[PDB]
RNA sequence: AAGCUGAGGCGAAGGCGUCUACCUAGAGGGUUUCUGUCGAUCAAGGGCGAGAGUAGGAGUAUCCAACAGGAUUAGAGACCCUGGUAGUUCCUACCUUAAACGAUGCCGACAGGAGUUUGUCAUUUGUUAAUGGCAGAAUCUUUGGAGAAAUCAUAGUUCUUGGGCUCUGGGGGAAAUACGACCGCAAGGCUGAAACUUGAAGGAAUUGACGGAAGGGCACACCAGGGGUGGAGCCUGUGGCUUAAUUUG
């Protein structure tokens, strides 16, 4: 129970797919900023830690949200892609594009996909150092 | 679990409408309080394409602060941006990129900071791969970008501005002048951040088509 | 590594300095 | 529950030890779509494969 | 033709193409132009390169104006060879 | 001896240059010394036809991500962005693509 | 101070990237301005000099020598992970070293083509361009000469040996040392031996072999499987122990 729909109207929301190595987030919310059901690979998504970020486990979490959305029930959610933060400069993982596609074939209506990765303008030092990571 | 949270419609045209945009959900007003003691300056973020159902100008983005209401939330110009896809696409190598940040007051009671990005162009007779504008001929353009943008902003009120950002009127008035010096291909107006918004007066309620239900509450 | 050998002598010298002043 | 593909074209072979094929398939359910799935054994074009899960394509090529 | 070049008596092209100093006799590429604004009828001498912006006696506006090289002839103005 | 006239550095006329980072090592390297401008599709390819059923707004253009990539020699070789090659074709300063 | 950002520009080198106003220096070009050899190079002597480091204030977001845990390993004082103070930033004094590298001292002349490119001028309406001039910055080449070779339009014009100045090296260690001095708050810098010791230490390139280097191929090499061996008793071969001999490969 929620929308109190007018009759022949469409209700829209947001996705916020934060895709980063080690985890995936499908934290859907209203445009204003009131959070609806979220979920993620780590929580209800799986187990292990091995397979948090892997694109099956993102695909499982993105059905678990869209179970609820029809129920709430929204309709379609705008998708914004967040990769990772500024110092690292990392763009979204593979687990994004499986999470998006599970919402489509759930199925939930969509539109306006954006990359909202916080990139810096120069700014700060990375981890590691001069030589950086060497493994 | 979720029950008892009161959903409300969202609503100034301006450029288009299709006045209703979306439904935003907060919470029940529990006495001792107004509806406006929730929905406190929430921003929203919408393309031009959402209301007119048209491609073209799909990339441009608009934003509105939650200025007033309780029965139904009414809203006010927060600013503009591009989609990050579009802004990224414009940049090219082997060309002189040109910027111009302008602090500019409107005819009405906003204060704005506008931005822009403009590139040089090769054309016809030049065979070389890279054309670079001179420091002087780049600084000539920044004067043209400021002067056109600051004058066109200053003269007109803010509904005309927000129409002209869709119509790309100010874009074309720049390339007029540049033909004389540097051709400059590209030219987009990127951002306009609202620094100092007008406070909610009863004259502004009469302008923006905000109902009697709102100004009873939030004043 | 020559760098290190250099570091070792720097150290070696600083010790002979110490011992010597023991006796100024 | 127990859906039925059929092999349009064998693109090639894969795995570390060359153990498995992978194949373009068009669903026999008739909903339509093409899925790129890794099969185990040996596959002649036009063969029918039963998939517990219709979702997820394999990885890359 | 690296080996044979005739350098005592070169072409009229090649003297103009080579540098001011590099010619067989060194001498400059710059002369005193006569000038006239169509307003006046007074015929004014000037140095083509200049440094100083040129006026006639009568008017007020400079006849020629200074750049790096040759003088920049402002307005419709003309040259009588003398 | 000198392997390259360049010395692996593309800088002439200047004593100093800025540093960047390979995306993988995170290593600090001068800018002068393995960049790629990289356009990938944001959805995918096989995902895209499943999406365009469920799209609000008809037709639409599904956007592309852009990324300027900086590596470093150690990182570049491991990923097969660059490899070593024969002493004669080291000089070859054009990329693989070729046109008429 | 991303992207623009390049074998692009400026600066004596170290080095220098948002925009605005402010004070300041100069290279290159043009010049029928002026002076008239005022110059080249340099022991001493004088300044500038990455990053680290030091002293005293002002900061302290990020990252982080040390340090503390966690993993891995035989051990791990490390590589990987989570935290972390000194430092990293500004101001006033210091220190004076780097693969401070074009590992190529400075000024001067001449010797070959080719097209790039930065600044600026010249003759043209090919005017954000064409051809040519000086000054930069690189490049290419079936060119000449040089070099041990790699290679180099300078590393050419050198037994066909001499344009002018300065500094350095004289087999390898011992020795970025010792002693003595000067400079330094200190860390150190700078100048710089001998006893003794040794037959090589090095440079470039070729042929192999090798790589937990890359790319091509292959086979019971694995994959999928089938049947065994390793356990039990016995037959035989070999090591051990035994013996006069347990003949021997």
Account of the 3D structure:
- By secondary structure, chain C is an all-alpha fold.
- Chain C contains one helix and no strands.
- Chain C is rod-shaped, with a radius of gyration of 11 Å.
- Chain E has 82 residues and is mainly β.
- Chain E contains one helix and four strands; from the N terminus they run H-E-E-E-E.
- Helices cover 11% and strands 20% of the residues of chain F.
- Chains in contact: A-B, A-D, A-F, B-F, D-F.
- Chain A binds chain F through residues 10, 12, 76, 81, 89-91, 97, 100-101, 103-105, 107-115, 126-134, and chain F through 21-28, 42-44, 47, 50-51, 53-57, 60, 62-63, 65, 67.
- Chain B binds one RNA strand of 249 nucleotides through strand 6.
Per-chain topology:
The structure is cut from a larger assembly and holds chains A (135 residues), B (219 residues), C (24 residues), D (61 residues), E (82 residues) and F (100 residues).
Chain A (H helix, E strand, L loop, with lengths): L10 E4 L2 E4 L2 E4 L14 H5 L9 H18 L2 E8 L12 H12 L6 E3 L20
Parallel strand pairs in A: 1-4, 2-4, 4-5
Antiparallel strand pairs in A: 2-3
Chain B lengths: L6 E3 L13 E3 L20 E2 L1 H4 L7 E9 L5 E9 L1 H7 L6 E3 L2 E4 L5 E4 L2 E3 L15 H21 L2 H10 L1 H10 L6 E4 L3 E5 L5 H6 L4 H6 L2
Antiparallel strand pairs in B: 1-2, 3-4, 4-5, 5-11, 6-9, 7-8, 8-11, 9-10
Helix pairs in contact in B: 3-5
Chain D lengths: L2 E12 L5 E8 L6 E6 L8 E4 L10
Antiparallel strand pairs in D: 1-2, 1-4, 2-3
Chain B binds one RNA strand of 249 nucleotides through strand 6.
What is this structure, in a nutshell?
Chain A: Belongs to the universal ribosomal protein uS11 family. Chain B has helices at residues 49-52, 84-90, 135-155, 158-167, 169-178, 202-207, 212-217; strands at 7-9, 23-25, 46-47, 60-68, 74-82, 97-99, 102-105, 111-114, 117-119, 185-188, 192-196. Chain B is α+β, with helices and mostly antiparallel strands.
Classify the helix fraction of chain D into a percent range.
under 10%
- β-strand amount of chain B: 15-25%
In sequence order, what are the helices and strands of chain B, one letter per element? EEEHEEHEEEEHHHEEHH
- Neighbour order of strands in the largest sheet of chain B: 3-4-5-11-8-7
Query: Which structural category do the helix and sheet elements of chain D fall into?
Result: mainly beta
Radius of gyration of chain D, whole Å: 11 Å
Topology of chain D as a string of helices (H) and strands (E) = EEEE
Count of discrete domains of chain B? 1
What is the CATH architecture annotation of chain D? Beta Barrel
Q: Alpha-carbon distance between the termini of chain D?
A: 27 Å
CATH third-level topology of chain D: OB fold (Dihydrolipoamide Acetyltransferase, E2P)
Organism (chain F): Trichomonas vaginalis (strain ATCC PRA-98 / G3)
Family (chain F): Belongs to the eukaryotic ribosomal protein eS26 family.
Keywords (chain F): Ribonucleoprotein, Ribosomal protein
GO molecular function (chain F): mRNA binding; structural constituent of ribosome
